[PDB]
RNA sequence: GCUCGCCGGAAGACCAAGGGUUCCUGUCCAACGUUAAUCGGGGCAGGGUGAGUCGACCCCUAAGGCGAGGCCGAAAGGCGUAGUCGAUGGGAAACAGGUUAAUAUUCCUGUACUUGGUGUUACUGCGAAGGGGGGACGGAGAAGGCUAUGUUGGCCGGGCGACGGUUGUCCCGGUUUAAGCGUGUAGGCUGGUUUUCCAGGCAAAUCCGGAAAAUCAAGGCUGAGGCGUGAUGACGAGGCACUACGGUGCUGAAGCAACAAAUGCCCUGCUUCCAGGAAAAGCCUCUAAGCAUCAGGUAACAUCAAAUCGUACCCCAAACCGACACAGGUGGUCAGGUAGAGAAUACCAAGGCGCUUGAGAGAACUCGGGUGAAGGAACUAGGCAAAAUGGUGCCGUAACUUCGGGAGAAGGCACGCUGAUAUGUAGGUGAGGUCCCUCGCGGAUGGAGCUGAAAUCAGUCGAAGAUACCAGCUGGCUGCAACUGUUUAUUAAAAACACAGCACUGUGCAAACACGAAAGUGGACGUAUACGGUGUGACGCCUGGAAUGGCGUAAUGAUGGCCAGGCUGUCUCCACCCGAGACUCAGUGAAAUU
RNA sequence: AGGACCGAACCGACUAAUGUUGAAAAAUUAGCGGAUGACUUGUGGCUGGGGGUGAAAGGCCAAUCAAACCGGGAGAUAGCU
């Protein structure tokens, strides 16, 4: 949710923040955090989703400082808590489950030989057993208009179609909120703690 | 431990001063100039076996030398460890 | 204001020390010309 | 030794880095101290730093270097594993009083805590290079309690005033008690107890977590502070005897309540926001093989051990860095009262000092200032400088605009002290009594006493009551630049530099590009809302002289200039006074140049 | 909430004066700027000279920088004094 501010002072004149008040406040799960030096913590997120057949219930939603997308904490039926990618249509207390069946709803993962034509699929695996690469940024969506043959065809966000082998996993549903483009940071000082330095002009 | 010849080279010379004279009556502590390393076991065993008196507690401090200017060349004095030997009850010379 | 020599014994021994000079191949040339000329104090003694 | 003055959120004190005996005593005056010096940070000789509880060392670890092996390369070397160094971090523990010419939480006395081992008694599922817990974290803001601390009152000890009064509602001093243990209150966190199972924690678990049942709602944990022990104590105002007159020995009364209140503890807490805010070791728990009369762990007592290293002294400076006993700089800690909102400003407490040259006359001239006949910018390139306003309450406050601002607009009245409401009011805090109960560090009434704003009326004194100091001049038009910001250390702080947003192209991961004989690496532990380059720079008219922006814009500015009220020795035009030099004298004592 | 306002410690030195064998091979005084964020600082490491770095002045790299210092070629060259 975005809220515009009243121009009490310039620079803090046009600052509009991109946040969600549904998320929590405080520290995340500390054993899944490391140093991640050059200061930001690194979340441990299962991109592969190798445990199949065991269901999971979503407890809460967290924010990620590394990526522009949001993650989610799942609860397996045997006492394991890990993180996955949070889609747009997630609610509190939803049952998600991986496996060869992977019923059609946003929040499951199945190999690309079983994707229905016309649905939005993100988090596409290319190399066998690596995963995680495509559609990590917010506001992206990839649709498939053709599945048949020895390779599936993907209409990527960049604007070109690419044929990928059908023995790789894929995540149903789409990415979350797309308001990350709408942040303009309002001032010069906002880009100072984000690591980017001012650019020296060549003709200066 | 003993190694009796090790304990004989710890004690260099007894030290006389106006502080040791008052410490002998008020605190019953004798001041002894000891060697460079001079561990607390060697000092307590050295006074315990050599002076044959019952040692209660041992203190040590390093005495830094000075710079003596006598002529063109510079000079320095030998460093020595001041040792405080406090006995149980009895006094000696 | 600030002067060009602010003292730091740890920075002086980490850079100009006897062991950092010995750990380099060209530092033994500095010690070679030093023992060739024959100064009393080489660099430092802790 | 007496008197005056300065600093006193320092010019005071313990300290860190650095210095290296500069610390203390006796003696000496050649040089050293800008003068003499009998003195000293100068010399001579002697002394002085006492650690299981202070720190360093040690265990582990970020940035980073080395990096046995190993990849590549003419040599050199580039890169890098398993490892290892590397505090700016974490990890064991002590306080009070006293003492010397110098050192103390280290020395004497009293009282605690911590680590490892041995012996005895008694009990026992012990056991990591493994797992879990915790260690373990950003910025801003608010409330309450308490302590150190200050005041009043009581009490104790000493006095009746060098000049009017002062046995009083008087004056002077004190009213300190620690660490630890027990109690677990203010406050915060979490729903507990029992039982069954488990694909996660590479195998395992009674442990962490998950999945099902019954009961109860207040149990469990962290945690400042108050009370008891500590303390039939020490310290203490003030005393008594022997004296090298320096001290020694001994004794020593009261040592409590209320109020205010810390930047200090509860609080690594609570609320809120997004930029989402190190790792590891010690410790507890759980088991795998094994050990299971053994060994290890657990409760108590006694004993042993806790080594080495620094401990003097300045440290917002005469001792460090500037060649100096130099008007510069240098980490953080302690932060009293009165007036004030304040660590600013003025005075004093403890403490440290009057800055290592002085004495005469009061001339010209130089500097810091003060006052001033009449005018008030006429002086100057230029209200530069100087002068002037400066604080609070009441009526009241314009042009413009992005509606936040301009604004404290300007402009009219009052400000001291004393009595009344009230022999001190609103508010805060709070004693004694009453009642109830687990019965306590407990709760409801209730006000003793203490502290204590703000306003009104009346009277009174001074020329002047924001009485001193500190402490915005005000209103209009206009160029550039949105703004806060950056630089030519040491002559230009601007229109030059930077700017969020915006416009264009390319890049599908073994990504573009850049770095390299190669290996390797950044981008990036990123994923087309992402990445590299280019031009412009909030915003409105808009982009057909019109984003190498045209025209303006509230606010902003060590930015250029004008006028208007007041103001002034800036000027007319200089006069007097307070200071430091310049004049003389005692002593030391150069240079530029020839 | 705040690169918001005034104003301390603190930081840079805009104006005016002084200083130029100075207290000082860049410092003081009085106004003036920021003053919770694009702030500052200690300690430790890295980036090295036809290079590093640079909110870009051709600034800085130990009181020196329109190519640091030391040693070497070198008693270079000089048509100059």
UniProtKB/Swiss-Prot annotation, chain A:
Keyword line: Acetylation, Ribonucleoprotein, Ribosomal protein, RNA-binding, rRNA-binding
Organism lineage string: Bacteria, Pseudomonadati, Pseudomonadota, Gammaproteobacteria, Enterobacterales
Subunit structure of this chain's protein: Part of the 50S ribosomal subunit. Forms a bridge to the 30S subunit in the 70S ribosome, contacting the 16S rRNA. Interacts weakly with S6 in one of the 3.5 A resolved structures. In pull-down experiments interacts with CedA.
Protein name as catalogued: Large ribosomal subunit protein uL2
Keyword rRNA-binding: yes
Family affiliation: Belongs to the universal ribosomal protein uL2 family.
Organism: Escherichia coli (strain K12)
Misc note: This protein can be partially replaced in vivo by its H.marismortui (HmaL2) or human (L8, from the 60S cytoplasmic ribosome) homolog.
Single GO BP term: negative regulation of DNA-templated DNA replication initiation
Disulfide linkage: none
Full-length numbering of the shown residues: 2 to 224 of 273
One GO location term (cellular component): cytoplasm
One example GO MF annotation: structural constituent of ribosome
Superkingdom of this protein's organism: Bacteria
Name of the gene this protein is made from: rplB
Function: One of the primary rRNA binding proteins. Located near the base of the L1 stalk, it is probably also mobile. Required for association of the 30S and 50S subunits to form the 70S ribosome, for tRNA binding and peptide bond formation. It has been suggested to have peptidyltransferase activity; this is highly controversial. In the E.coli 70S ribosome in the initiation state it has been modeled to make several contacts with the 16S rRNA (forming bridge B7b, PubMed:12809609); these contacts are broken in the model with bound EF-G.
UniProtKB/Swiss-Prot annotation, chain B:
A Pfam short name: Ribosomal_L23
SUPFAM superfamilies in the cross-refs: Ribosomal proteins S24e, L23 and L15e (SSF54189)
GO molecular function: rRNA binding; structural constituent of ribosome
Name this protein carries in UniProt: Large ribosomal subunit protein uL23
Family of this protein: Belongs to the universal ribosomal protein uL23 family.
Keywords in alphabetical order: Ribonucleoprotein, Ribosomal protein, RNA-binding, rRNA-binding
Any one GO cellular component localisation term in the record: cytoplasm
GO biological process: cytoplasmic translation; ribosomal large subunit assembly
Keyword Secreted: no
InterPro entries, sorted: Nucleotide-bd_a/b_plait_sf, Ribosomal_uL23-like, Ribosomal_uL23/eL15/eS24_sf, Ribosomal_uL23_CS
Keyword rRNA-binding: yes
Subunit structure: Part of the 50S ribosomal subunit. Contacts protein L29 and trigger factor. Might also contact SecE and probably does contact SecG and SecY when the SecYEG translocation complex is docked with the ribosome.
Biological role stated in the UniProt entry: One of the early assembly proteins, it binds 23S rRNA; is essential for growth. One of the proteins that surround the polypeptide exit tunnel on the outside of the subunit. Acts as the docking site for trigger factor for Ffh binding to the ribosome (SRP54) and to nascent polypeptide chains.
Gene3D superfamilies documented for this protein: 3.30.70.330
Curated annotation (Swiss-Prot), chain C:
InterPro entries documented for this protein: Ribosomal_bL34, Ribosomal_bL34_CS
Short name of any one Pfam family annotated for the protein: Ribosomal_L34
GO cellular component terms listed in the entry, alphabetical order: cytoplasm; cytosolic large ribosomal subunit
UniProt entry keywords in alphabetical sequence: Ribonucleoprotein, Ribosomal protein
Gene Ontology molecular function: structural constituent of ribosome
Biological process, per Gene Ontology: cytoplasmic translation
Presence of the UniProt keyword Ribonucleoprotein in the record: yes
Assembly with partners or alone: Part of the 50S ribosomal subunit.
Family designation: Belongs to the bacterial ribosomal protein bL34 family.
Record protein name field: Large ribosomal subunit protein bL34
Biological source species: Escherichia coli (strain K12)
Name of the gene: rpmH
């Amino acid at each position: 949710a975005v809220v515009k501010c009243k121009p009490t002072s310039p620079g803090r004149r046009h600052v509009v923040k991109v946040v969600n008040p549904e998320l929590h406040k405080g520290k995340p799960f500390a054993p899944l955090l490391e140093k991640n030096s050059k200061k930001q913590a690194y979340r441990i997120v299962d991109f592969k989703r190798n445990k199949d057949g065991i269901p999971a219930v979503v407890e809460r939603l967290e924010y990620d400082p590394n990526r522009s997308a949001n993650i989610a904490l799942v609860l397996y039926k045997d006492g394991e808590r890990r993180y996955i990618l949070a889609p747009k249509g997630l609610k509190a207390g939803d049952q998600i489950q991986s496996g060869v069946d992977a019923a059609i709803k946003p929040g499951n993962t199945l190999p690309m030989r079983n994707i229905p034509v016309g649905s939005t699929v993100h988090n596409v695996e290319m190399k066998p057993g690596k995963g995680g690469q495509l559609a990590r940024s917010a506001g992206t969506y990839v649709q498939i208009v053709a599945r048949d043959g020895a390779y599936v065809t993907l209409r990527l966000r960049s604007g070109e179609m690419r044929k990928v082998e059908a023995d790789c996993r894929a995540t149903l549903g789409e990415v979350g909120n797309a308001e990350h483009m709408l942040r303009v940071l309002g001032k010069a000082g906002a880009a100072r703690w984000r690591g980017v330095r001012p650019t020296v002009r060549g003709t200066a | 431990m003993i190694r009796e010849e090790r304990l004989l080279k710890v004690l260099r010379a007894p030290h006389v001063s106006e502080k040791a004279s008052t410490a002998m009556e008020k605190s019953n502590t004798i001041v002894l100039k000891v060697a460079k390393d001079a561990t607390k076991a060697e000092i307590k065993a050295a006074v315990q076996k050599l002076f044959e008196v019952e040692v209660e507690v041992v203190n040590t401090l390093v005495v830094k030398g000075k710079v003596k200017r006598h002529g063109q060349r510079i000079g320095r004095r030998s460093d020595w460890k001041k040792a405080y030997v406090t006995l149980k009850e009895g006094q000696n010379l | 204001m600030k002067r060009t020599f602010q003292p730091s014994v740890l920075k002086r021994n980490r850079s100009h020390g006897f062991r950092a000079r010995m750990a380099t191949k060209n530092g033994r040339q500095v010690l070679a010309r030093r023992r060739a000329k024959g100064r009393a104090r080489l660099t430092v003694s802790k």
